[PDB]
Amino acid sequence: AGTQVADAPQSDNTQQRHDYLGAHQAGVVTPRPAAGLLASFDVLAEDRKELERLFRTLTERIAFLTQGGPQVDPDPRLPPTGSGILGPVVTPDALTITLSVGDSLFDDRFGLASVKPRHLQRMTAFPNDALDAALCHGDLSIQFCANTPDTNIHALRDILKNLPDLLVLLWKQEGTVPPVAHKPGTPSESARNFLGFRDGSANPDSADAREMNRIVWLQADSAEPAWAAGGSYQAVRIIRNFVERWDRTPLGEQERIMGRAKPTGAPLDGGRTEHDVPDYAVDPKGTRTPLDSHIRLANPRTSASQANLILRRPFNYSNGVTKSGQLEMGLLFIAYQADLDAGFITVQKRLDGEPLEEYIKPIGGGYFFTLPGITRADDYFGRSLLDASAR
């Protein structure tokens, strides 16, 4: 293959396509691809008209970018239609774009406060946090997922190109997960995090609409405002890993901080695969699965704890080198739940003081409400929020 050194890699994955219409936005129960980008913005709109145009315009960009197609530049004296990163024919590359609104959007600016989702709130500092003020909150989060980082970056460029007057980017975190070798005829396997552990084994069934309806998605008739039906609460946490320290920790200690076997992801009390679960009823004292191990604290597997299940959808992030010359990398923790208080906050409240904290440090993120989907291309994300607020 007389391939030139700068030839672009070729991949059949570029034409994969996820629909952006539905009862829900894509990117929540959609299978997580190899590349991710979570960006936070402040809305610069000064009124309900400009906020409507922002919602209409984001929708328009989502429809094109996630489905792809030709991009014609109108005239040489004008800026080009887009950045051109994906060529004159934009490829979707399995891109999903998920829109979520922060607590701060429901201030006095737009007259939405009286229909704010009832668990929506500003993220507050947990005891092991070292929050960078510049990495927290935002009027609007946008989660981009695609097969390769250039597709999310291209989507980011396009949105900022078309809304530089209504959006200011505040902070962003890109991330990835390591793909595994194909192997048809084997159970699918959970991606690893940068601590080298399988990450997602005990997620609830993302392919089970009944399970998602009671764990992830807001339901119509409930204590929530009716417009918010089909949305979800989104918790984002930028979590440093002190990796050099971790890599100097004995394997057996890594396994009892996490409470799973490292190479397999199996329970520490038996079972071969990562789909097995420990039996805490058998082990009340934590002699197989430590009481203070990460999983056992995150989910003690009591009947009461089934109210605190969450859907994790993380990426791994690599940001550079610190001043003591250590790798600036960690977890881009993203999680969805029908109830933010019973979910992420309760779980993190259980996790405070866990031994893992010796190796991790949340530095940023915030809480957002992922908006309901649209089934009608005449419709647009955020519309029901504007109408509900309009009584």
Please give the distance of CA 354 from its chain centroid, rounded to a whole number: 23
Among 154, 198, 313, 383, binds ligand HEM (CB under 6 A): 198
Q: What's the rounded Cα separation, in Å, for the pair 24 and 193?
A: 27
Tokens of residue 74, six digits: 């109108």
360 part of the interface to ligand HEM, by CB under 6 A: yes
Q: Which stretch binds ligand HEM (CB under 6 A): 96-104, 146-154, 193-201, 315-323?
A: 193-201
Among 195, 236, 243, 371, binds ligand HEM (CB under 6 A): 195
Q: Which is nearer to ligand HEM, 199 or 224 (CB)?
A: 199
152 part of the interface to ligand HEM, by CB under 6 A: no
* Dihedrals phi, psi of 331, to nearest 5 degrees: -120, 130
Among 199, 231, 381, 384, binds ligand HEM (CB under 6 A): 199
Query: What residues does 232 pair with on adjacent strands?
Result: 370
Provide the CB-side half-sphere exposure for 2 (13 A, CA): 0
Least separation in angstroms between CB 326 and ligand HEM: 16
Site string for ligand HEM, 316-345 (x = CB under 6 A): ---------------x-x-x--------x-
Least separation in angstroms between CB 62 and ligand HEM: 28
Among 26, 45, 101, 310, binds ligand HEM (CB under 6 A): 310
Q: What's the rounded Cα separation, in Å, for the pair 215 and 308?
A: 8
Q: What's the rounded Cα separation, in Å, for the pair 233 and 222?
A: 15
Among 38, 170, 202, 386, binds ligand HEM (CB under 6 A): 202
E strand map for the chain: 35-43, 69-70, 89-90, 96-102, 140-146, 167-176, 232-241, 311-312, 315-321, 327-337, 360-370
Provide the CB-side half-sphere exposure for 204 (13 A, CA): 26
Alpha-carbon dihedral sign for residues 251, 254, 255, 260: negative
Query: What residues does 235 pair with on adjacent strands?
Result: 335, 367
Q: Which stretch binds ligand HEM (CB under 6 A): 28-36, 78-86, 168-176, 191-199?
A: 191-199
232 part of the interface to ligand HEM, by CB under 6 A: no
Structure-token match 């399995």, residue found: 94
Least separation in angstroms between CB 323 and ligand HEM: 22
Q: Which is nearer to ligand HEM, 45 or 309 (CB)?
A: 309
E strand map for 226-359: 232-241, 311-312, 315-321, 327-337
Q: Which stretch binds ligand HEM (CB under 6 A): 1-9, 75-83, 151-159, 346-354?
A: 346-354
Using CB atoms, what's the residue nearest to ligand HEM? 202
CB 232 within 8 A of CB 337: yes
367 part of the interface to ligand HEM, by CB under 6 A: no
- How many residues touch ligand HEM (CB under 6 A)? 26
Alpha-carbon dihedral sign for residues 263, 265, 268, 271: negative
45 part of the interface to ligand HEM, by CB under 6 A: no
Among 299, 337, 370, 384, binds ligand HEM (CB under 6 A): 299
51 part of the interface to ligand HEM, by CB under 6 A: no
Q: Which is nearer to ligand HEM, 197 or 217 (CB)?
A: 197
**DSSP string computed for 173-213:** EEEE-------TTS---PPB-TTSSB--TT---TT-HHHHH
347 part of the interface to ligand HEM, by CB under 6 A: yes
Least separation in angstroms between CB 324 and ligand HEM: 20
Query: What residues does 260 pair with on adjacent strands?
Result: 267
Q: What's the rounded Cα separation, in Å, for the pair 244 and 322?
A: 12
258 part of the interface to ligand HEM, by CB under 6 A: yes
Q: Which stretch binds ligand HEM (CB under 6 A): 64-72, 164-172, 179-187, 234-242?
A: 234-242
103 part of the interface to ligand HEM, by CB under 6 A: no
32 part of the interface to ligand HEM, by CB under 6 A: no
Tokens of residue 367, six digits: 């809480």
116 part of the interface to ligand HEM, by CB under 6 A: no
Q: Which amino acid, 367?
A: Y
Q: Which residues bind ligand HEM (CB under 6 A)?
A: 193, 195, 197-202, 237, 239, 241, 258, 260, 294-295, 298-299, 310, 331, 333, 335, 344, 347-348, 351, 360
